[PDB]
Amino acid sequence: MREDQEHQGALVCLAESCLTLEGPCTAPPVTHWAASRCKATGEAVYTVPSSMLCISENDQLILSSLG
Amino acid sequence: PSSGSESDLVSLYEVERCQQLSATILTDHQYLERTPLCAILKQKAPQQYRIRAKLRSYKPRRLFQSVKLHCPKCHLLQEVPHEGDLDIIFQDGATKTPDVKLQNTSLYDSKIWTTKNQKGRKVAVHFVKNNGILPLSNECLLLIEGGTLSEICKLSNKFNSVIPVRSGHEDLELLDLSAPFLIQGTIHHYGCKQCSSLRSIQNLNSLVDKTSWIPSSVAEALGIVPLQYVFVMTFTLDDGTGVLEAYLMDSDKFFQIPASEVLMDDDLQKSVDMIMDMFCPPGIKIDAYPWLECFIKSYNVTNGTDNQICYQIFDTTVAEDVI
Amino acid sequence: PSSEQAWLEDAQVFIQKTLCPAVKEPNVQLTPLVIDCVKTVWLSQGRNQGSTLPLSYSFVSVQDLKTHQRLPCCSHLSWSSSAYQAWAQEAGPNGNPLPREQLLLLGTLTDLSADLEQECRNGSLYVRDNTGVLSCELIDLDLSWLGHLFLFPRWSYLPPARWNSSGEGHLELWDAPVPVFPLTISPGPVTPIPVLYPESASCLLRLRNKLRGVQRNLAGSLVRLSALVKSKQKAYFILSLGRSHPAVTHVSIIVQVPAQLVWHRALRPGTAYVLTELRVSKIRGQRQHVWMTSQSSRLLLLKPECVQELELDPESLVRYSRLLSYSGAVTGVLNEPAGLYELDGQLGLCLAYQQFRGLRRVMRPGVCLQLQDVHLLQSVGGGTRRPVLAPCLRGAVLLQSFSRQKPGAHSSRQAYGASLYEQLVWERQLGLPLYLWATKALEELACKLCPHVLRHHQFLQHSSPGSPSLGLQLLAPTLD
Amino acid sequence: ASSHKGCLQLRDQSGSLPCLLLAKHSQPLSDPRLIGCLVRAERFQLIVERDVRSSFPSWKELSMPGFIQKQQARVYVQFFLADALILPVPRPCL
Ligand SMILES: [Zn+2]
């Protein structure tokens, strides 16, 4: 069982060391774009209808037919 | 405005007599003859064209909005969830009670904890087994209920890949398809709620193997249709002969940067910022913008009953040395 | 097969393909020794406390590594993830750590390159197996190791830098390799070897006619070492042995045998050595001569009983630089291809006046350097405040420790142009302040003209008879 | 030579500057072949014409700031070709 328990304890060690066993939570690192999104939260976000972005499979068909 | 009319005049566009080199090369259809923009406008869609232009302007200016999720099954775009949204999901799992019959099985075994000080939060961990035996960490698919987004992220960094779940009365189930059906280090995989018909963890038995854990495979096993990552941008192309707005949608081609990882890796974000402020340097006049050769298709949207002609870029990439 | 049996069989197949010497039949006697070796080092930490064998790790060949890898990576065997992480954040601490991988590297370590225009020693080192040859960088090499088969337990692999077309990546060996076979300890000299000491040797280097009777050998502490000089064909270096350190009486020696260029890595100052089977060379313009090595020359570590000592102002801006010896660590790169680095965030280091062609593949943040007889030029001008340490051929660069950090991401504006600056220094023969200024001026020009008007690798190509290069032509009117 | 004005221009990746080349003292630039060459000049004049639409009442108010209602400059350069060095930009190559 030494090998088996060692393997399972490796997994358990990774888990528990990663888990916040006690105390308060902590802030992870944040990248440029993520922090900028957090700061800009509330701006009217940009988006586009997929209809405009080539939902026309008929046009796709005759396009791909072209040489 | 007098200076207005002057600056307007110096902001005009010279008709391709220039000495500069191209910034972008099209990978395919190079044989096509150049079609001036005006010639395109005077023709009805759909059609293929090969053009040379400069970006007079592009959107969105704040690039952190440019990334979108995409479902290929129904061709639907979807916004990326914020970390606050994921928190609003994971928060409902912190208070749940683990069930005895969901602990240890032929397919997965578990370990439990109660995290102190954190309002008495409950957490349970389950490890999936290969042929009934725990695989090595590099292949160890791990399942969580009660872990936070940061914790599950840091754990996914260590284990192969991890699946958020909750206590289903029959068997473990993804606590919400809004959350990632699979997080694999810096990669979060999501699914289309419309097209999906999800399945419980036991249905991992449908997999060809219990070692690769290919995201597509496990998504199919769990009955989830995975969403692609794509950039979506609008280029305001100008060629003096005319002005044309064309959309760019691509995954890991145009910028040669993985749209799946860009949101979580900072160097890629620096890279895309640099690219877009190298096509469109800040402040200086359109005289100095570099030429941009690209291949575009045209097609009729007809959402307004008819017409609504649009253009989309294809098969083009930034030149190697320009990056 | 069992997991362990499967692993053993896979390792045996790998050895049969990659490592069994083609000189002989695939002798099975090899596999038990390598298995014992890897098991030994795996257990030596006592941190495994489980599997007797690191089944996780997978063996790799040289060609396999070249074709499979295209990222920086570290392959520490016999360390826990905890120890690996702590070591990776040991010095930075916040620096980007080399990503860990679980590969086992074994092969033959030797000076012999694969090239054949000459013997092509050139002081290079390579790891060899059946699949190919790969160059490596090693600290304080014991020349005894050359030619033996080892299991390297701690190494970094760095892919070829993006700018480099040759694509010849290189390894970094962090610690002494574990030889697969038991130690082949061979007997040294029991007789006290007669050697001339530096004072008598100096007398003889003056009075070359008196080179008779006394044995043509030497010994002493390495007090001064030169960089490797590479002429049209003659690649050579010079060193100096002193009777003591710090002390006056010392004698210089020139080493020119191609097979012996590898010694340049073996030697290190302070330690005392024995040189043998020498002759006194004659060089144009050297009134006092120097001793030189023959093909029969042996390099040997000194042990006393093994030797017998044979004894017979803006008013006038000209300013002089101060020699000294320095030890420090590179904090960051100012201009990589020109060879301008920060030491400790305090001193500028300009290598361009040495050959500098090899160090560029090692030099990155966190490297530890010891510089001997570096010229210190403070107040160098051109707006550059930082005093610029600058080695010349008389000094030498000693790598103390490799870097833990992964190399910086390639930027097309940054890497290109080393040949042009090399030309500036070794053909136009500029001085240090003007070289600094030219570097900054070419930065400005590249910021004006490239990449849209003229790509960098065209703007900064070396001026040649076939075609000149704008970078030199736009500067020439001022340099003249 | 900018085809929206006919006037010559020195141009690079940062913008453009109007220029007034002379071939030599009392002889104008006469050769179309200079288009696109890389011009280097280290003995040149930078001119600045200032237009102002002031409303000062008298010599007294020339100490006051509020009356300079509009300011326009018009900066350009001028020099002889004999004082410049001219290099042709190479073609792209690989
Ligand atoms: Zn869908």
From Swiss-Prot, chain A:
Residues 1-67 are annotated as: Interaction with POT1. It is found in: Nucleus; Chromosome, Telomere. It comes from the Eukaryota. Component of the shelterin complex (telosome) composed of TERF1, TERF2, TINF2, TERF2IP ACD and POT1. Forms heterodimers with POT1. Identified in a complex with POT1 and single-stranded telomeric DNA. Interacts with STN1 and TINF2. Component of the shelterin complex (telosome) that is involved in the regulation of telomere length and protection. Shelterin associates with arrays of double-stranded TTAGGG repeats added by telomerase and protects chromosome ends. Without its protective activity, telomeres are no longer hidden from the DNA damage surveillance and chromosome ends are inappropriately processed by DNA repair pathways. Promotes binding of POT1 to single-stranded telomeric DNA. Modulates the inhibitory effects of POT1 on telomere elongation. This is Adrenocortical dysplasia protein homolog.
UniProtKB/Swiss-Prot annotation, chain B:
GO terms for cellular component: chromosome, telomeric region; nuclear telomere cap complex; nucleoplasm; shelterin complex. The chain holds residues 316 to 634 of 634 of the full protein. The keyword Disulfide bond does not apply. Keywords: Chromosome, Disease variant, DNA-binding, Nucleus, Telomere. Belongs to the telombin family. The keyword RNA-binding does not apply. Component of the telomerase ribonucleoprotein (RNP) complex that is essential for the replication of chromosome termini. Is a component of the double-stranded telomeric DNA-binding TRF1 complex which is involved in the regulation of telomere length by cis-inhibition of telomerase. Also acts as a single-stranded telomeric DNA-binding protein and thus may act as a downstream effector of the TRF1 complex and may transduce information about telomere maintenance and/or length to the telomere terminus. It is found in: Nucleus; Chromosome, Telomere. One of its GO terms (biological process) is establishment of protein localization to telomere. GO terms for molecular function: 8-hydroxy-2'-deoxyguanosine DNA binding; DEAD/H-box RNA helicase binding; G-rich single-stranded DNA binding; G-rich strand telomeric DNA binding; single-stranded telomeric DNA binding; telomerase inhibitor activity; telomeric D-loop binding; telomeric DNA binding. This is Protection of telomeres protein 1. It is linked to Tumor predisposition syndrome 3: An autosomal dominant disorder characterized by an increased risk for the development of various types of benign and malignant neoplasms throughout life, with age-dependent penetrance. Affected individuals can develop neoplasms involving epithelial, mesenchymal, and neuronal tissues, as well as lymphoid and myeloid cancers. The disorder is associated with elongated telomeres. Ubiquitous.
Curated annotation (Swiss-Prot), chain C:
Belongs to the CTC1 family. The gene is CTC1. Component of the CST complex, composed of TEN1/C17orf106, CTC1/C17orf68 and STN1; in the complex interacts directly with STN1. Interacts with ACD and POT1. It is linked to Cerebroretinal microangiopathy with calcifications and cysts 1: An autosomal recessive pleiomorphic disorder characterized primarily by intracranial calcifications, leukodystrophy, and brain cysts, resulting in spasticity, ataxia, dystonia, seizures, and cognitive decline. Patients also have retinal telangiectasia and exudates (Coats disease) as well as extraneurologic manifestations, including osteopenia with poor bone healing and a high risk of gastrointestinal bleeding and portal hypertension caused by vasculature ectasias in the stomach, small intestine, and liver. This is CST complex subunit CTC1. Component of the CST complex proposed to act as a specialized replication factor promoting DNA replication under conditions of replication stress or natural replication barriers such as the telomere duplex. The CST complex binds single-stranded DNA with high affinity in a sequence-independent manner, while isolated subunits bind DNA with low affinity by themselves. Initially the CST complex has been proposed to protect telomeres from DNA degradation. However, the CST complex has been shown to be involved in several aspects of telomere replication. It is found in: Nucleus; Chromosome, Telomere. It comes from Homo sapiens.
